[PDB]
Design a protein around this ligand. Sequence first.
Ligand SMILES: [Mg+2]
Ligand SMILES: [Zn+2]
Lengths: 145, 29, 48, 131, 97, 46, 80, 223, 359
Amino acid sequence: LENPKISTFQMNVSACAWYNADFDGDQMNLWVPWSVMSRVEAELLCSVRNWFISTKSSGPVNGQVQDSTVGSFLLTRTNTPMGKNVMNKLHAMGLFQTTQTDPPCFANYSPTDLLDGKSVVSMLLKQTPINYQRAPTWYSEVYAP
Amino acid sequence: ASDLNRSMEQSIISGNKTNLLNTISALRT
Amino acid sequence: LKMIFATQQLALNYVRNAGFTVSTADMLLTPEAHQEVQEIINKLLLES
Amino acid sequence: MRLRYERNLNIGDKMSSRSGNKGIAALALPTSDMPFTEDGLQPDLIVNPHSHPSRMTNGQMIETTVGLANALQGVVTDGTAFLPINVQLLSERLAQEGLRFNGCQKMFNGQTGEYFDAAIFIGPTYHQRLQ
Amino acid sequence: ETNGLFQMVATGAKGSNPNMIHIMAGIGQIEINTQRIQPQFSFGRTLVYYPRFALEAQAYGFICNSYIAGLTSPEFIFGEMNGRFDLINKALSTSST
Amino acid sequence: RPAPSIMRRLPRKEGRIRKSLLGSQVWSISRSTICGNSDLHLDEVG
Amino acid sequence: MLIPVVCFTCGFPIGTYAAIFDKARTEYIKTKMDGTLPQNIPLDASLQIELKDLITALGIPMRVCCRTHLITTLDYRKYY
Amino acid sequence: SMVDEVEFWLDVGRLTRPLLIVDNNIEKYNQACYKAAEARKKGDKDWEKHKIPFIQNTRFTSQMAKDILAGTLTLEDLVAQGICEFITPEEAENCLVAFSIIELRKHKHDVTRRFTHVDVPQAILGLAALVSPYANCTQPARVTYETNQGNRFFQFYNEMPLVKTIAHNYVIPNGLNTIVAYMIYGGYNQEDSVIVSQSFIDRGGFAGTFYREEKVEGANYEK
Amino acid sequence: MEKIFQNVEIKPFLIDFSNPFIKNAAKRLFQLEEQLPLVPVNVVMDFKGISRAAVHGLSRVLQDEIPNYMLDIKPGGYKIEDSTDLFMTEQFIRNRINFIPIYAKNETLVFALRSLNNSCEVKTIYSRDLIQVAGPKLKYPIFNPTFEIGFLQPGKSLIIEDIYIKKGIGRKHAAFNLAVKTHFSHLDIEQYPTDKKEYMALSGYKQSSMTSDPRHHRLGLCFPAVPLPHINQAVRTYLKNACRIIIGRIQSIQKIYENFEEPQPELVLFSLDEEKTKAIITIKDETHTIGNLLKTCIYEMIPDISFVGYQCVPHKQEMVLTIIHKASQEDLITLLEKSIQNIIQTFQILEKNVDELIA
Ligand SMILES: [Mg+2]
Ligand SMILES: [Zn+2]
């Protein structure tokens, strides 16, 4: 970070699950390897991609947390108070402008066309296909009555 | 001599270190 | 990890347009619900 | 010898409300990038709603409501603990002063200028910086 | 559809049903070690605010109010006992672990 | 308490073994407060 | 130490009227609290008088931030 | 009462607190009850009329509150009269206290709940606790449950809170009435983070001077 | 003809002297029985037939990103002496002086502040104590004389010599901020009655922001200090300046386009081999204004565009605009030039309408 006024170690929120950390004043150590052997070992063996699946439980340490979870629920929500959960071409395109990935193709959509959140999520997931059927936390027998 | 005052001072020095709410609470502590 | 980041960005960008908030009125029962709760509490106290 | 350092609110400086709620300044935005209501009011601080449930700090919300009402009226009221309180009457007082019952307002995204679909809860809350 | 707190609780983002029931509709009985408030103050007394051998539930840690409604002095005191117990247990468990 | 001995260096959490041999002080290291950044990948640090 | 030159939130120059306000308020408060004024006057009671019309007369717009910072800011001269 | 001893204590270190005294007419109630029993014995059947209601109250009045706020009356004056008295933890074992005047009014005519004193609720909190507003509407321990476990700054600007508590009649407020928005804005305020306004910082909000004293006192300048 | 800028409403904020307390306080403190030389001005303007992006870009350019003047103390100006007050530190006085709104046309003016408290009570330093020491004599004040510069304890003094006019933009330092937001609404979209409890949780508009495309807006901004006799003129200049600023920025981007086929660090254009051309433009020290404006105009010009987006990452201090379109490099460049020319013409029409209306 080339801003001289920033002096904190900035990390993605979803990474905190690795260290059990919160931005409430928690401090952290950071050291950059300088030798070739240590740099090679850090890059090839200790990368956080290796810690994604927990060794303790054999499960995914990292996932969407807080605003990402509610945002996903709202995005894939079928109906909003205004009506159907749809967006025009411009906003569907704008959803993908900060993903740091290859943008999908919207050449087949008219500016007046309407896209659901399920459609944009479908493009993002079709980037890497997977099959998944289950029930959400939204559906609870406690609230059903 | 110096031993009396210095030793009493030291007895006060051990910890016992002193916005306004914090100071008043430390006094009330 | 890449898909986690991308999905997080998608959700945040969506919430950028459909705002989210919590207010005080979100925790305020209606008078009828308040009366129902009072009835339940009174029943528990009666059993005691 | 005495040394003085000019200390502005830097990124990474702890901020806390009266009811706990310790937090860290994570980002600073220009005035043009901050959200604004249709009346032009914009926030000094933006706080995630996800802290309230676990922290169970409803006092901050009640303080925000009463502060909105007081600022509109131009008074300073007593919010001491264990005094009689009626949140419904506070919301009605907000409604009388020309605001909404829940205190929410129409807000716009400062960066893009697009109004949020949901009314946002913005109000004056007392904050301090931890040492 | 338009409740932020409920949407956060139900979607699993934050909170739980007991939190909602405590914030609204009443905290209910306070339990420490699956037990009511024991008479520590004096023989047959739990607090200076209640008589010896009190029979009402409120004298042993039953809170009829919610956080939004507001807690009276004895109810606040009992909640304080419970919260401090949670903190002390957490610290002891951390050390032992 | 101020009784120097050779064999009282070894024991305890402040002793030679647990403070000097197991664990150490190191150069080329930094420490600071951590905050959030939504524009950093899960494997990036600012 | 003083009312800020500009509103902290929006930057509206409240300070231009600050001094005048601090005077007017005083007089206004006295008038509303008719009778003996020996400084026994309860501060928590003097703060209950509504200054909405006074600030409106000063010309400050009806903005929450400006009113808050105008009426709540502490003055070092009074305390020290 | 378990043992018949009576103890008088006058040593240092005894915590003490003022408490309003509760008076009642239990003697008159007992006399009326005995008179009614005698009436029943006589068979006249007016015994119900002889009995009188039980009354328990406190001598504190609104005029006394006004005098206290005006500075005319002090705790010494109240203690000199019978309104209030000092109670210690030792003597508190013999006191039955109503936690608020609301309780006393609720049991005003209840011979089953004769109270010895009335307590102002705010008395169960310290200054630091009293700083927080509507503390009874929050569970302060659970707030810190996440935060549990684990050179002078002078700040130019401070303001009185819009929702002030009693604790601010005795301490100087340190802070500002910041406009807080409770919303999701880009996910930069997660996990207790907060998004700040650059203009708010520039305008002097929470800006001050940090003072460090070198009173005790390679390549270096020396010039 | 086009009349993008349809209606304008200018209303200065004045002091109501009919209030006895305000009148007495003003007369006593400052012998002031009239409106101050500089007053804030609230301008409400209606725009029709213009995209929301352009209107909001103009709004935020006025709030900041527009050149503006402040008062600053040159290094060494704060003279430390034996009688200097302890409380009135240089940081405090500098902060107070910086945020005094000014309306200055000449940057050569230099002021000075020399105050001594010879009395036995705390004195108050006001802005009227600021005296001009360099530059042509001011025929009209550039700041109001009522600001409380500070206060001095008895026997103390404050001497600051070099106080000059500094130029800058708002986003770099808040002291350069010009406009204060007061209103923003869309007249094209119908609104619910929000007083009812079934709509108090919604924004109040009948159309979701994810599908709505408004074209009729009302924007109201407050200027902190303009000369009372010249209000209409001052506001006009501001607006015109803003337009020019935006055009200038846009023109810069246009130049980058006109130099395609020449190695440039900002423009990186390649062929995705699907008959799609991808162009990335990186501009340093660029804000959401230009990025959003460019995205909107390009999207309008090319409805069937494969993709157009922009990112202004806060920690990168740059704007990256990505355009993917099923066309050859030259065709895409021509389309982008057409869009830029369209937006430039829109803002020129806006400037002309400003001149016709406010005058
Ligand atoms: Mg933490
Ligand atoms: Zn303001």
